[PDB]
Amino acid sequence: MRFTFPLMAIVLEIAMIVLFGLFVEYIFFELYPLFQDVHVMIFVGFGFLMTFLKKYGFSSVGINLLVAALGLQWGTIVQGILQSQGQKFNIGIKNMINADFSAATVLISFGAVLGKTSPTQMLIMTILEIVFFAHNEYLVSEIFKASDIGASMTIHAFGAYFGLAVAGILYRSGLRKGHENEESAYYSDLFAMIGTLFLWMFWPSFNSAIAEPGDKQCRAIVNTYFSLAACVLTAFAFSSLVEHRGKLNMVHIQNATLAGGVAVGTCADMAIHPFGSMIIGSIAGMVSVLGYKFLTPLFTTKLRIHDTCGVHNLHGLPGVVGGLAGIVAVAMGASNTSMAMQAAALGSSIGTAVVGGLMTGLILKLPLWGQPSDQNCYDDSVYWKVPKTR
C-alpha cells in the first residue's frame, strides 16, 4: 500500500539469492569487451534513449537501471535452468551476455508502456517477461534450430509485441487524445541522443557477441556496421520526406537510425554481403520512419494501443523485416537451416510475445501496484523527488 515496492523488490532479491545459491556456480577474456559494449547498451543506451520525455528523465533512466539490474539476475537463473534442464550449472561470459539480452527484451517492452506504469509493475513485468522470452528463445534455438544471432525475432519482435499487448490491456481512454506531459524538451532530446548514439555505436558487439568466433563473428560485426550506416541515411531522408516543410524530427533521428541494426540481426552472421546488409538497413530506416509517421497515430487512436517510445517502429516492424530477410537469405543460400524453421521462429516469437504480454498486462491492470492517474502520467514527481530547478 505504501511499502509495496520495497517489499516486492526485497522479496525478489532474496529469491534471486536463494536461486543462485541452489543452482549457480562459477573465451572469457576474448568476449569480455563485447560484453562490456552490450552492458553499456543496456544501461546507458536504452536508459538514456527513453529520457526524451521532458518530465520523465529520472524515471526513464532509473527504472531502466532497476529493470535491467533485476533482469540480468533473473535471466541468468531462467536461461541457465533452461539450458541445464533443472540441474546446477556454471556461468561464464555467455551467461552474462544472454542475461543482458533478456534485460534488453524487457527494456524494449518497457519502452511501450513508458510513463504510464509504476516501478512495481515494472518489477512484475521483468519477472514474467523473462520467463516468456527465455522459453521462446529456447524453442527457437533448440527445437526449431533457427538462425537468429542478432535476435531480430527473439529479442526485438518479441519485446515489441509483448509490450504492445501490455500497453493495450493497460490502455487508458483519457490518454488517447494525448497528454500535456507526453512531450520532449531540448536538453531531454540531447540526453536521448546520448542513448541513441551509444546503442548505434555498440550494436555490432550486440549482434556478434554470441556468434561463432572466426568468420561468423567478423561477418556479424561488418554487416551490423554497414547496415547501421545505411539506415542513418535513409532515416534522415524519410524524416525530411514525411514531416511538414521537410524538417527533421528528433523522434525519428533518435529511433529510426537503429532500425538497420535491428533488421540485420537474423542475417548478421549469414553471408549476405556488405551490400545486402546496406539494402536491409536502408529499408529498415525507411520502414521505421514511415511507421512513426503513419502506424503510431493509427495504433494509438484506432487500435487503443499507445506506444510511448514507438518501439513497434524500431523493434517490431524492423524485427519482422529481420525474420523475413533470414527466410529470403536461406532461399538464396546465404545460410543453411530450414526456410520453414526460420518462418516458425518468426511465428513463435510474435505469438508467444502477444500471449504472454496479454497475460502479464492482465496481472498489471490490478489496482495494487501504484500506477499513476491519467493526470500524472509521464511525470517523475509521482515516484521521485524532483528538483524545483530544471
Partner: protein
C-alpha cells in the same frame, strides 16, 4: 571580507605551469620506457580511466550551478594525479619504468583523490585541489610503503585499502573547511556518471589481481553484488525519505554500495550467492545510513566511509575461513584509518591558508567564482 573573488590570473597559471615543468623535469631524470596481450592489458587501464574521468567527473556534477567545475576540475585532478603517482610509486617502490600496468596503478592512486575530492567540491578552487591531490597521493603512497615494510606485503598490492583511505581522507579534509541545490539536467548528467561507474566497477575490483582465475571470480562477484545493490538502493530509497519518494542523489551513490562491499574480498568469495548477500547487506546499510547519518557535511561521502569500513570488516570475516591474521589485518586497517585522518587534517590545515585565495563561504557551489560568463561586471 570581500565576497567578490580575488584575481587568480597570476596564482593559478604560475602554480600549474610550475607543477607541469617540475613533472617534465622529474620524468626526464627518473623515468624510462618499457606483447601478445597489449590491447587486453590496455583495456583494464582504459576502464579505470573511464571511471575516473567520466564516472567521478560527472557523478558530482549534480549541483545546480557547479556542474562545470565538478567535471573540469575532476579532469584537471586526474591529469595531475596520474603524473605525480607515476613518480611517487616509482620512488617508494625502489628509476621508474613506465608500463601500461604502472599507468593503471597510478590511475588507481589518482582515483583515490578523485573520490576524496567529492567531499570538498563546491567549496575549493583549483589551487586548493592541486594541494589536495599532491598531499593525498603522497600520503597514500606513504601508507602503502609503511604497510609493505611492516606486514611484508607488496607496495602495489597495498592499493586495496584505497576505498577506506579515500573516504576517511575526504571526510577529514571536509571537516577542516569553513562551513557554508539540485537541478534536473545536472541530475541526469550525474546519472550518466553513476552508470559508467557502476558498469565498470568490476574492473577496479580486479586491476591488481595477477592470475586469470582470481580476476574472473572477482569480476563475477562484483557484477552480482552491484546488481543486487542497485535493486536494493532504488527500492529502499523510498523508505529513507520524509517525502516517501525516490531520491536521485541517493541512487547516484548507493548504486556502488555492493561493489565497495565486495571490493576487498571479491577474489576470496567462491560462489555468487555470497556476493549477492554482501550486495544486499551493502544496500540495506546504505539505506540505514541515509536515514540516520544526517541526524548524527557530505552524506554520500559519509555513507561511503561506512561502506568502506564494512568492506574491510567482511574481508576480515572472510579471511579467517580461507587468530594472528585477524590481529595483523585489524592493525593494518587501523593504520590506514589513522594515516588517512592525519593526512586529511594536515591537508585541511594547508587548505585554510589565505594564499590560496579560496572562495568566500557565501559563494560556495557556484561556477561564477571560477568561470567566465557573458554580461558580467568584472573587477573594480
Amino acid at each position: 571580507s570581500s565576497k567578490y573573488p580575488r584575481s587568480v590570473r597570476r596564482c593559478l597559471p604560475l602554480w600549474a605551469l610550475t607543477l607541469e615543468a617540475a613533472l617534465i623535469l622529474l620524468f626526464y631524470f627518473f623515468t624510462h620506457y618499457d606483447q601478445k596481450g597489449l590491447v587486453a592489458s590496455y583495456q583494464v587501464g582504459q576502464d579505470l580511466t573511464v571511471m575516473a574521468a567520466l564516472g567521478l567527473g560527472f557523478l558530482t556534477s549534480n549541483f545546480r550551478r557547479h556542474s562545470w567545475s565538478s567535471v573540469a576540475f575532476n579532469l584537471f585532478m586526474l591529469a595531475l594525479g596520474v603524473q605525480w603517482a607515476i613518480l611517487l610509486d616509482g620512488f617508494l617502490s625502489q628509476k621508474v619504468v613506465i608500463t601500461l600496468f604502472s599507468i593503471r596503478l597510478a590511475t588507481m592512486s589518482a582515483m583515490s583523490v578523485l573520490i576524496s575530492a567529492g567531499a570538498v567540491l563546491g567549496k575549493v578552487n583549483l589551487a586548493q585541489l592541486v594541494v589536495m591531490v599532491l598531499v593525498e597521493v603522497t600520503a597514500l603512497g606513504t601508507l602503502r610503503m609503511v604497510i609493505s615494510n611492516i606486514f611484508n606485503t607488496d607496495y602495489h598490492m597495498n592499493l586495496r585499502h584505497f576505498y577506506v583511505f579515500a573516504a576517511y581522507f575526504g571526510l577529514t579534509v571536509a571537516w577542516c573547511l569553513p562551513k557554508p541545490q539540485r537541478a534536473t539536467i545536472p541530475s541526469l548528467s550525474a546519472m550518466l556518471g553513476a552508470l559508467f561507474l557502476w558498469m565498470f566497477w568490476p574492473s577496479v575490483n580486479s586491476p591488481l589481481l595477477r592470475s586469470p582465475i582470481q580476476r574472473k571470480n572477482a569480476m563475477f562477484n562484483t557484477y552480482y553484488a552491484l546488481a543486487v545493490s542497485v535493486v536494493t538502493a532504488i527500492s529502499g530509497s523510498s523508505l529513507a525519505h520524509p517525502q516517501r519518494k525516490i531520491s536521485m542523489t541517493y541512487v547516484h551513490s548507493a548504486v556502488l554500495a555492493g561493489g565497495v562491499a565486495v571490493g576487498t574480498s571479491c577474489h576470496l568469495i567462491p560462489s555468487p550467492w555470497l556476493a549477492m548477500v554482501l550486495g544486499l547487506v551493502a544496500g540495506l546499510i546504505s539505506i540505514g545510513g541515509a536515514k540516520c547519518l544526517p541526524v548524527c557535511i557530505s552524506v554520500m561521502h559519509s555513507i561511503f566511509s561506512l561502506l568502506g569500513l564494512l568492506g574491510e570488516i567482511t574481508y576480515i570475516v572472510l579471511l579467517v575461513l580461507h587468530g594472528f591474521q585477524v590481529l595483523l589485518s585489524i592493525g593494518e586497517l587501523s593504520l590506514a584509518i589513522v594515516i588517512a585522518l592525519t593526512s586529511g587534517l594536515l591537508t585541511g590545515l594547508l587548505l585554510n591558508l589565505k594564499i590560496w585565495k579560496a572562495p568566500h563561504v557565501a559563494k560556495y557551489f557556484d561556477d561564477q567564482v571560477f568561470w567566465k560568463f557573458p554580461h558580467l561586471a568584472v573587477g573594480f
